[PDB]
Amino acid sequence: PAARFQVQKHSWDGLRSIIHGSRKNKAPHDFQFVQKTDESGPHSHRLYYLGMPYGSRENSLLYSEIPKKVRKEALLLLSWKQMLDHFQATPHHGVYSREEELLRERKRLGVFGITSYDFHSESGLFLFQASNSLFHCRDGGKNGFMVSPMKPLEIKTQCSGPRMDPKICPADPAFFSFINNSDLWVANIETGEERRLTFCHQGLSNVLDDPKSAGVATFVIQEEFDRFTGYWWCPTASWEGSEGLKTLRILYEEVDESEVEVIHVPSPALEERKTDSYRYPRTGSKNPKIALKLAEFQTDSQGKIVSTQEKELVQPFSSLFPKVEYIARAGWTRDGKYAWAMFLDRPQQWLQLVLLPPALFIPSTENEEQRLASARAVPRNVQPYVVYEEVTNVWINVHDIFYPFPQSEGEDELCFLRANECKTGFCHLYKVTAVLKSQGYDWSEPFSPGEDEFKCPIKEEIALTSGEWEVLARHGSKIWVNEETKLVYFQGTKDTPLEHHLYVVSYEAAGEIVRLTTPGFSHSCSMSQNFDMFVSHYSSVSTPPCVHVYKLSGPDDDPLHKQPRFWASMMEAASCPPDYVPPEIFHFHTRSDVRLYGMIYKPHALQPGKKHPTVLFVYGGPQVQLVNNSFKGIKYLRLNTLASLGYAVVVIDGRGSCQRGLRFEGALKNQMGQVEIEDQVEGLQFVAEKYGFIDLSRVAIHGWSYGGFLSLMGLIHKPQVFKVAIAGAPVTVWMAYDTGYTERYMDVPENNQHGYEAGSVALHVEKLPNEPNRLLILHGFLDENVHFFHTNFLVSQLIRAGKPYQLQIYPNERHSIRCPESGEHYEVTLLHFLQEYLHH
Amino acid sequence: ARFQVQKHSWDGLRSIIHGSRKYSGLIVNKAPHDFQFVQKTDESGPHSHRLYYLGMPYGSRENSLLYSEIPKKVRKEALLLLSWKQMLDHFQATPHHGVYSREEELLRERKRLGVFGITSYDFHSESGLFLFQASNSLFHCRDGGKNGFMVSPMKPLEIKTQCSGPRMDPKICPADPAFFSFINNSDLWVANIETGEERRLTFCHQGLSNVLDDPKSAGVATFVIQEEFDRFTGYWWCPTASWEGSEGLKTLRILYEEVDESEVEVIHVPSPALEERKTDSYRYPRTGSKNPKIALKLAEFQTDSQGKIVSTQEKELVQPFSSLFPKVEYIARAGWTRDGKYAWAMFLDRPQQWLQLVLLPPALFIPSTENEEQRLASARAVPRNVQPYVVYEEVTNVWINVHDIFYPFPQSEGEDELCFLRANECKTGFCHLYKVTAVLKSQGYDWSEPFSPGEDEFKCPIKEEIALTSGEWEVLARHGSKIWVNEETKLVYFQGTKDTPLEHHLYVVSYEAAGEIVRLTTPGFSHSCSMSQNFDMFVSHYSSVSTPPCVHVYKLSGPDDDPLHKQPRFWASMMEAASCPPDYVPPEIFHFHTRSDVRLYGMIYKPHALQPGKKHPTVLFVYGGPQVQLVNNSFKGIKYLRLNTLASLGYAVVVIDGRGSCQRGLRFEGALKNQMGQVEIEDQVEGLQFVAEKYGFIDLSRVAIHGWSYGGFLSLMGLIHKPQVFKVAIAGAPVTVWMAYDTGYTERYMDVPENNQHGYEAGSVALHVEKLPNEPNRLLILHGFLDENVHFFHTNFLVSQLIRAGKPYQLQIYPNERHSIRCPESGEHYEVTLLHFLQEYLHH
Ligand SMILES: [Cl-]
Ligand SMILES: [Cl-]
Ligand SMILES: [Cl-]
Ligand SMILES: [Cl-]
Ligand SMILES: [Cl-]
Ligand SMILES: [Cl-]
Ligand SMILES: [Cl-]
Ligand code: NA
Ligand code: NA
């Protein structure tokens, strides 16, 4: 038969040398296209973005000039121009305030420097956080275009502590907003006047007695709903009152975390031996009490803030919308006529999109007579409108795509584009027309509306897309709508679940879908609001990422068939290193006839007739797809390093993984751990049969977070398949994880005792090996996501069951290893564990 | 020539450890303790005494209040086993599931209490009142005195309260047992046990929502005082009543320490309810940082003839504590003279090289007030001849060990001197008893004038100082050791190491005509003794390396004209020794002289069934820090059974008491001053090499070093400084950075960081990780996650440094353990882990 390949044994310092030698940049992102309006000049656009070029040590604000003409037989590489002159945005040592540090963790930001900016195109104002403060600069508009970097200007404050989530006022760019000490503020950038708008935070010495915030996304909203803001500027000014003062409006979420459980997580300054306190809603326990409110302020001709007002719903949020647990998203119609919100129930099986006219909000007051007078003055024809409802027996994934069209005068309907997955089980674009008919309400007379009370008739609902593929509507994916040509641009998996592509379809006469991106790569695209050009950041399994600029070209009478003409490069693909070998993608059909995709890192310098020790690298949880046609060598270089030593590395996207529709991910509903391990084992056995170089007697299972959970599930349920498990930051008891994630997939513990018990690996330690050196646990001590508690509880159970274990801690790490020295130590530790204990 | 230990499966090692403990032949904490002898008052009856104590009898799961009857006569050639009687009828003292309040749990950690149930009681002999904590509350019962002696167990009576939260540190008022005191929410309270009336005396704690804005306490010993000075109370009853009110009222007095922890650094340690994922906050003074601000104050209250608490007063020193005593960092001890004429305190400076014993008359304390006019009136009224008296001062270039022995003789009226007994170590370098006479004369102070004390302010002339004991041995004066003084016979009973540093013995000497010292305990055992307050009998709790502990009652017998030569006569047993278990082989004690000619003691556990010409893998078991002696002639099998288990598998186990260890005088422990880590490893290696040469069965190529706390520190120091000597180290709860340990301990032995940068740097193993092995499987770190003494931070920081230096390590954590492993499942897992690590990695 086949010989068994033996990986070379190295000393510990030899393994350090291999890892250090193996490790012998952020592409342009967050694009703004600005048209240049001068016929004589050679540039059509300035393109603004964030990037870290090769010579730089941080992410900063950059621009490139897009030429009117390019040579056909020559590749233009655009110069990256610095907006900021010798400006360090990173604070000392890359040590952020706790507020900025935790936001960077929630957003998975690793790069130092400016990681976001707000831009007002008409004025050319840029507003961003830098150096523990707020800075601005101006380019374009009336001031003209810079040709060398400028010093940004610090915005002075009398506020104590961080100014978070800064945004420019759309209607009047003299104003911006920020959060300070859990309240919403505004300031005039020109005069330096600041004004507090909300008064939720009392500033009590005992923070636990001070549980309200305004304008803030709480922990579960940031970690599990991908929402990082709790306030939304009205895009328009209004002129109520006889004095002729200008009113500016902000919709905001007020939260009360009083009933939310408090946990303590060690702080990164280890020598201080202290914790930070978190309102951490564990599954089955209380989420924050929430409401939408309206903050208003008035300004005079000189830009002086004359007055401020908190307004609340004329009847309480909890009375109007009694089954709402979460606000997923909110915003405004472009005319400011309606605020809107996306509401979820606690089971996350029911979503409503609701219009809220500003007239439904009345001034907050302690005076009962004034409050009742305000309520009585709300016009009878003012109400919430539920313009869309999504219901499922699986779960609602929050999709970010909701595009309301402008209404005509006297028109009692709203037309909108909506991404909807629950209708067919695949996320698709629909054009929806809702009828807005006033029932007539006496808002001074309290009532208990049911769920259907404010429901709008649907006049029309047109599928713009259909089939067994997805429109991408999550984690930064969006649509772009050209109302002149009646085209919607979107990203999707129509060509293959392995590649993201840009497409265009008519929303007027839904028919042909045109693909605008190059097949054989996975694309991340940014479209000009003038629909004249777009950027694609793309890669393949074999080819490092590039960033290319395309001009949409051809007859204006045929907009659907505009050519994406390659125009210029912002970044050419790095050379594939000679010691990097891309993984190979495969697919197979399970015994139940489900198609699964996988990847295999073949042992380097592979010889026929030899079976190699194998690492099954697993994530396996919802909302992630590990296997796709994109470059893996930046994020997963360590898997190439394993293959270079003679390990085979296998990755399987089993049922529960994403980009395959709701029914595919729905397989794990209420039974997390169970179908995932069956698919991992079927995949491993398929790879062994097809490729013939897998030694099934020497398989390690390794993953982080959900992957750490499945590594332990593998050793517990399939101890004859998996010789060793290496479990990083594992979930070991689902009852210790949060509401937003755990309840979506598993229900509350009281409703799914069997599934919680079967899925909690710390309750099955009696099934873990009674042999030493089969189990290595790794965990960041500062982890605020999968708490170090999960590992501590697992260890407590291992001691009680009389089981051996190996443990490594990363004292200075949260949920991921960010420090290069700790990353190398982790990789050396893994190589050592495999060389000693995966071998017989 | 090289012995190989038999390799076992993990489950094989579990079976060996489980069998070793289940079938140990020994039982933990079976010894009765906290003895009170009461004479019986019936001439016809068969008993001379009732003996009260705490114990856990064979058919019980907890410590309760017990008694035994001491008979008037015993048969000479017959062994009386005293019947243990329950005082309390079917009473569970342990709270539900053995889960104590955070306050009681941490006090049990500071006191090293493992047993469940009643762990202490206060007793008032004249009334026969017992006062104790049980079941998250306060209970009492009465026996003897006016009530009579019970013949069967009684129900204890709960003391009702309207207080919120625990009533801690309860004490009976000595002058009037109708009254008792307790601490509630960091303030001093008193109550009438007969009427149920309660009264708050101190108003330090505001009860603010933010506890960090509420930093004052009264009557409480803070963290460093409990952990490093062995003091668990911050208040002291005046033993006498006074009648100075013009209304027929009786005044009772309590001296108390007020603390302000405002400037003390706050740290967070995880709570034992792991599932709550929370921490408790500690005012933890790290070395070099602020200790609490302290003052002695006086609480007074008046009672009427009905026992009603009529009025209370907080009084403070007429000049601030900080003005009168500007070099005082710590109050080590306090109390009163037996007549109540003076409060006294033992004061330490921050370097802990200067101790003062100071008398404070109650007239030096005036009413606390915000009214400046009333304060000045009070200060002007303090008599000119009222002052502090420094009656004794101890100064050293090493450090002051706090000795608990201070016995003031009551003064005569108009006598301007104080005679007292005092244990003093700094005078000769050995702890000895002195009879001292100080002269108490005032030249006068205007206490209304601002005060700046000179050198020798308040210092008393010493008229006489008689050494009652002397030599190169110690009177035991710490950690429970005390003297007993018979003022009728002029004899002082004490414990010491006069016969050998390997055994504690009971002795007696005259304080009148200091001369012959008589030994009352049997040589060849180490004794822990309790003397009757009538000096007619004593209890000895004793053992040897070969014989498990017993508890015996002795009668002191012979002519009343020759009290110094009263003979100890065996009377009865409270607990016979278990047999030495047959698979337990006692260690052998040896001594050797270092190359510097210092005598060191050690012990060896020989490999079981030793064959000649065989060299065995060896475990050096190490503590090596101050205040501990591992090597003495007492039974080690209850605490150190695991060392017998290692020897039964064929490991040699070596223990060395190196320089820095205790019971050898101040110079011997003083060798590690400002250089912790340095001399300790040299002595461990000299001992290991001595044992290898003398016994011939030590394989010096296969030596593991293992210890806990200071021993974990030295295990790492061994692997860093002597990597050719120590093949592997197992470091439990190690101190890895001295800058993270506390003021009381670290500054005593090492000074502050800013004064000893070189010593702190050299002694902090986490700053020398580049010297730890670049080979895997030579270092195992173990730590309790909940450790509030040696914080888990020490291990976390060591790991952080190991990662930065690219070093391998193995780690085990005990998520549910503080500084010691208390859970049997965790103890077994620890022992299995150690056996597996030695079998795989100490072998080639
Ligand atoms: Cl966060
Ligand atoms: Cl095979
Ligand atoms: Cl199996
Ligand atoms: Cl098993
Ligand atoms: Cl004797
Ligand atoms: Cl080395
Ligand atoms: Cl134990
Ligand atoms: Na999906
Ligand atoms: Na000593």
Curated annotation (Swiss-Prot), chain A:
The keyword Hydrolase applies. Ubiquitously expressed, with highest levels in liver, heart and muscle, and lowest levels in brain. This is Dipeptidyl peptidase 9. GO terms for molecular function: aminopeptidase activity; dipeptidyl-peptidase activity; identical protein binding; serine-type peptidase activity. Changing residue 572 to R: Reduced interaction with NLRP1 without affecting the peptidase activity. One of its GO terms (cellular component) is nucleus. Dipeptidyl peptidase that cleaves off N-terminal dipeptides from proteins having a Pro or Ala residue at position 2. Acts as a key inhibitor of caspase-1-dependent monocyte and macrophage pyroptosis in resting cells by preventing activation of NLRP1 and CARD8. Sequesters the cleaved C-terminal part of NLRP1 and CARD8, which respectively constitute the active part of the NLRP1 and CARD8 inflammasomes, in a ternary complex, thereby preventing their oligomerization and activation. Its EC number is 3.4.14.5. The active site is at 705 (charge relay system), 783 (charge relay system), 815 (charge relay system).
Curated annotation (Swiss-Prot), chain B:
It comes from the Eukaryota. Optimum pH is 7.5-8.5. Little activity below pH 6.5. The active site is at residues 709, 787, 819. It catalyses: Release of an N-terminal dipeptide, Xaa-Yaa-|-Zaa-, from a polypeptide, preferentially when Yaa is Pro, provided Zaa is neither Pro nor hydroxyproline. Its EC number is 3.4.14.5. GO terms for molecular function: aminopeptidase activity; dipeptidyl-peptidase activity; identical protein binding; serine-type peptidase activity. InterPro entries: AB_hydrolase_fold, Dpp_8/9_N, Peptidase_S9_cat, Peptidase_S9B_N, Serine_Prot_S9B/DPPIV. GO terms for biological process: negative regulation of programmed cell death; proteolysis; pyroptotic inflammatory response. Changing residue 117 to S: In HATIS; likely pathogenic; decreased dipeptidyl-peptidase activity; less able to maintain NLRP1 in the inactive state. Changing residue 709 to A: Abolished dipeptidyl peptidase activity and ability to sequester NLRP1 and inhibit pyroptosis. Ubiquitously expressed, with highest levels in liver, heart and muscle, and lowest levels in brain. GO terms for cellular component: cell leading edge; cytosol; microtubule; nucleus. Val-boroPro binds at residue 709. Inhibited by the serine proteinase inhibitor 4-(2-aminoethyl)benzenesulphonyl fluoride (AEBSF), and by di-isopropylfluorophosphate. Inhibited by Val-boroPro (Talabostat, PT-100), a non-selective inhibitor, which triggers pyroptosis in monocytes and macrophages. Val-boroPro inhibits activity by binding to the active site, mimicking a substrate-bound state, thereby displacing the C-terminal fragment of NLRP1, leading to activation of the NLRP1 inflammasome. Keywords: Acetylation, Aminopeptidase, Cytoplasm, Disease variant, Hydrolase, Nucleus, Protease, Serine protease. Homodimer. Forms a ternary complex with NLRP1, composed of a DPP9 homodimer, one full-length NLRP1 protein, and one cleaved C-terminus of NLRP1 (NACHT, LRR and PYD domains-containing protein 1, C-terminus). Forms a ternary complex with CARD8, composed of a DPP9 homodimer, one full-length NLRP1 protein, and one cleaved C-terminus of CARD8 (Caspase recruitment domain-containing protein 8, C-terminus). In the ternary complex, only one subunit of the DPP9 homodimer is bound to NLRP1 or CARD8. Dipeptidyl peptidase that cleaves off N-terminal dipeptides from proteins having a Pro or Ala residue at position 2. Acts as a key inhibitor of caspase-1-dependent monocyte and macrophage pyroptosis in resting cells by preventing activation of NLRP1 and CARD8. Sequesters the cleaved C-terminal part of NLRP1 and CARD8, which respectively constitute the active part of the NLRP1 and CARD8 inflammasomes, in a ternary complex, thereby preventing their oligomerization and activation. This is Dipeptidyl peptidase 9. It comes from Homo sapiens. The gene is DPP9.
